[PDB]
Amino acid sequence: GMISVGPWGGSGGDHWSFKANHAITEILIHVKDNIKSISFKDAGGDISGTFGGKDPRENKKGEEKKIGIRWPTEYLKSISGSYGDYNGILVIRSLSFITNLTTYGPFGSTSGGESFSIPIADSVVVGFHGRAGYYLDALGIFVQPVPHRTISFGPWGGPAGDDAFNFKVGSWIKDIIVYADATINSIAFKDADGHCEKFGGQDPNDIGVEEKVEIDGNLEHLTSISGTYGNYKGFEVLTSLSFITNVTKHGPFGIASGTSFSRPIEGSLVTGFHGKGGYYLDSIGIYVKPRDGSISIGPWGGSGGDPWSYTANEGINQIIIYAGSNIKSIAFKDTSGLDSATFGGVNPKDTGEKNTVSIKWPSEYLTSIDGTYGQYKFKDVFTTVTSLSFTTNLATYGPFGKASLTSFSIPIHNNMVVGFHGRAGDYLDAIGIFVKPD
Template sequence: MALKVEAKGGKVGIQWDDGSDYHDVTKIYVRGGLEGIQFIKFEYVKAGKKVIGPIHGASGRGFTETFEINNLEKEYLLSIEGYYNASTGVIQCLQFITNKKTYDPIGYNEGARFTLSASRSKIIGFHGFADKYLNSLGAYFIKIPSIQSAIEGAKTTGKGFDDGGDYDGIRKVYVTTDGSAIRHVRFDYDKAGQVETRERGAKTGTQHEFTVNHPYEYITSVEGTYAHTQPYNCVVLTSLTFKTSKGRASPAIGKVTGSKFKLERQGDAIVGFHGRVGSCIDGIGVYYAPLPPSPPPPEKLQGQGGDGGDSWDDGAFKNVKKIYVGQGDVGIAAVKFEYETYTSEVILAERHGKETLLGYEEFSFSLP
């Protein structure tokens, strides 16, 4: 069943809905003008045949651009970014992002910014509002199935394990090695913003950790080695190395000896693991899913108030958990903030302002 994402922009004009009974979007026509996007029109694929949708909006003076998505080369639409005028509600700019490329934007980067996206999903249909202009745009998404790799290392010894490939990404990896073999693995997966943990093997030896800055970073490659190793008298994994979409790599965990392997697929992220486990991790495989577009960077708003004193900047985090406000004789003496990072760690930032004898008032937020 398709996921319907709410239309972004003004909810004025005639409501329209192309539906979600399609397999892919194959062509998009967009006409822009001085006041914003005038109309949009889509061509879809259904049961291998092209379906031409109606025009949404109206044609005036302006320019039309056509965006073709090559479904034959397994290209599909992942997300749309754009801007709309908060006063008129008219869409000002649209940019289409597929698993193969990011197309040039059409229109003007002015107004309120929006994104139409869903984790590990592709767009198959659209809805929105229009009259003389395109006032809003929403989309229908369906999940893209993950692809299971073959197992590297032992393929028959031990017992099979399978975490599945229905996760949005990986937040943290734990690997335990005893110097000759990988004994234990644990994966903290992200699923709809919640952590789900899976672990296999015997936690005997030294544990190593590798943290991923999800959703801004994904594991894209697993390299390793395997060998017939004593005293286990069977083929086991001897080392593992993880690489990410940001170009980072973990140290080689374990002893790099034996046959080498690499689990990687161009343009994909690793979203799950499977393999074989006995007294050690005997073999390992992965699940691939399309590497999603990076979330837009946080928007930095100008500070309000006076410009005296020293400038400070805590940076950007996933959430604000608590705010501490220190009262002074003539106003606010100090503030400090407790944050949640993208790896679910909680940190208390430095105090900004002068310490106060009047104490702090604490404000806590209930986070999902």
């Protein structure tokens, strides 16, 4: 799917939204003291309508400018501009067009209003939305990641923090653990699977107070964040935060001081975080995916273990499986480097042997899994997956482990596997798949 950003400007005129089928290669504007109208052309040569330009007065036509994007080598990544009063109406006064190579603009008046910019990385502008009548009341963008990347916002805060962090998750962000009083002392995260995370919080003299947010991820999801950054005991840091969902706002935690950051985004899901800490939380950014469903099959195996799941962002490239007389652990690698956790293998005295499956994406993609489950006894008796195999549109890989009496398979066709789920602890208790058509 795509993430919406903005729109910036007024609430007059009529709403419009133009998603280009191919890359945006041309923007035409008419502009004088403000932007009278805008239209787009795409790589295959389709034009959008002309949005705005409806003032009947000849003076008020403005001048035509054409911005050409030199596809396929140049691609639009972002915009900047300004909005303000024009003869009484809150309107887009100027625009810039931000490419991977350069900036076209600014076009229109940069005086008499308020500017905007976007703290975004790794995006491609795939469309626009906004408002118009006589003029361009409002404008915002639609974005997708550049190939094999994930759109980034931020980071906000200071340039300090000796312990940097990045990660992304294949499922959702489920628990957030924050310490704070005067500022944000530290931040940690618990992936739906129970895999945890941590940051900041290294001042023995300023520890703050713990708060816990559980995101109830079937109905609720983390869509964005807001907060504040400012000078704290000399350091430029993040001083408050709030975790924003479709259901509610969790927080704010901390103390709002310095400068507020918000992000006008819609259609987003926060899959990850990046930034730096130390004594406190110097900086933080987010990774977002489009709130783009899978069918779910299984899981097969025992009742033990913590639930886990993994959905590839792009397409699953690799599977790492540890086996002995049962399956010990399993992990996934996708084409865009979004590794999954290792599910299982928590006991260092029983981790078995490594096996690997390679899948030649895109011409090869996973079709299903097969296997057995049964009882395995180590220090205690468990019912877990004991053997596993995988099928692609081209081949079968595996088997791995030791077959037991109870077997499972799926006579499925015209699909692709887009992720896995199950339960795991010391071992892979249970496993199933997520599939989509085609």
